[PDB]
Design a protein around this ligand. Structure first.
Ligand SMILES: N#Cc1cn([C@@H]2O[C@H](CSCC[C@H](N)C(=O)O)[C@@H](O)[C@H]2O)c2ncnc(N)c12
Length: 323
């Protein structure tokens, strides 16, 4: 054998689900993924929504839903052979669809999520996921163009890179991750993302997910030539952050770093004793908290935007030529 099938709206291979349908965690299962998938394709195609205008325990009841969607997809496909313009194919997903796609990719890839908590505590290996909503905020505030290169340093299972790649026109997106468990899941995330995006008929920008160490010699130059870095450095600690500062000091004017802990103080005043500090070459601002997003600390969740700006330093030196 028994199985359920959803035809792609753009004629990719159908999505196949075994029966009984699996459960992913306390709040996500495959039956709900199916209903939401039908729902989202309905948002991509008005005619399908019109054609679609009820029990997850029952095989028959779910086959009935799948067949009703599949028959409607067949009629849409015939509409497209007639006068009707077929859905535009080269487009990015809406934010809503993207959220659903990443959820689905994660659930099909991260087969045993508890294995992601088998890091050494109190180490730079601590794993935590940045939320979809934070990443969406960064995407909206940090305008990227096709001149930009994007890197997630310590990319985990890769979902920050996938979201940015789906949403922006950067020339390339990278993630680099050192630990074996998340880098292995990242390989599946990559394959599942490419598959599901083709299924929905949606475009992404170029991206690569790599197993590596972002403190390596190779990565010094890569960081220097990156225009937008995302780095969830909340548990990296002061030694690792110091090393990252050494690498950021070679970035180009206007390069930007978005992070969970600031690399320089927000109140940095250049003076005689701090000439060497990375605060001499960057503006730092705290991004606006998203409404009602509390951290474990109780206070709202804090991300920081750093912009490389050596005029700070140039002006310090021009000032020393004056009383
Ligand atoms: N020091 C150090 C290192 C620590 N990481 C990784 O950074 C991650 C921080 S969790 C953030 C995950 C995702 N970007 C998100 O925000 O949702 C962990 O997976 C850890 O293994 C590294 N990876 C590559 N090279 C390194 N040198 C390190």
């Amino acid at each position: 054998k028994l199985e359920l099938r959803l035809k792609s709206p753009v004629g990719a291979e159908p999505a196949v689900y075994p029966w009984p349908l699996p459960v992913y965690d306390k709040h996500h299962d495959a039956a709900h993924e199916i209903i939401e998938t039908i729902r989202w394709v309905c948002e991509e195609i008005p005619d399908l929504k019109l054609a679609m205008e009820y029990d997850t325990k029952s095989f028959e009841s779910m086959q009935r839903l799948c067949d009703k969607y599949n028959r409607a997809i067949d009629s849409i496909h015939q509409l497209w052979k007639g006068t009707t313009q077929p859905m535009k194919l080269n487009t990015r997903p809406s934010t809503g669809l993207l959220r659903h796609i990443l959820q689905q990719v994660y659930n099909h890839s991260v087969t045993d999520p508890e294995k992601l908590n088998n890091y050494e505590p109190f180490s730079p290996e601590v794993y935590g996921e940045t939320s979809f909503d934070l990443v969406a905020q960064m995407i909206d505030e940090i305008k990227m163009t096709d001149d930009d290169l994007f890197v997630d340093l310590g990319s985990g299972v890769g979902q920050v890179v996938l979201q940015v790649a789906a949403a922006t026109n950067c020339k390339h997106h990278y993630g680099v991750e050192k630990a074996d468990i998340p880098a292995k899941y990242a390989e599946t995330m990559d394959r599942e993302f490419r598959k599901w995006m083709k299924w929905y008929g949606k475009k992404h920008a170029e991206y690569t997910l790599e197993r590596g160490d972002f403190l390596s010699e190779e990565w010094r130059e890569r960081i220097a030539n990156t225009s937008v870095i995302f780095v969830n450095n909340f548990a990296f600690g002061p030694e690792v952050d110091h090393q990252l500062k050494e690498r950021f000091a070679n970035m180009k004017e206007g390069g930007r770093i978005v992070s969970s802990k600031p690399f320089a103080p927000l109140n940095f005043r250049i003076n005689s004793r701090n000439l060497s500090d990375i605060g001499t070459i960057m503006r730092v601002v705290e991004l606006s908290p998203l409404k009602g997003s509390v951290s474990w600390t109780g206070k709202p969740v804090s991300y920081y935007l750093h912009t490389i700006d050596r005029t700070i330093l140039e002006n310090y030196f021009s000032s020393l030529k004056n009383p």
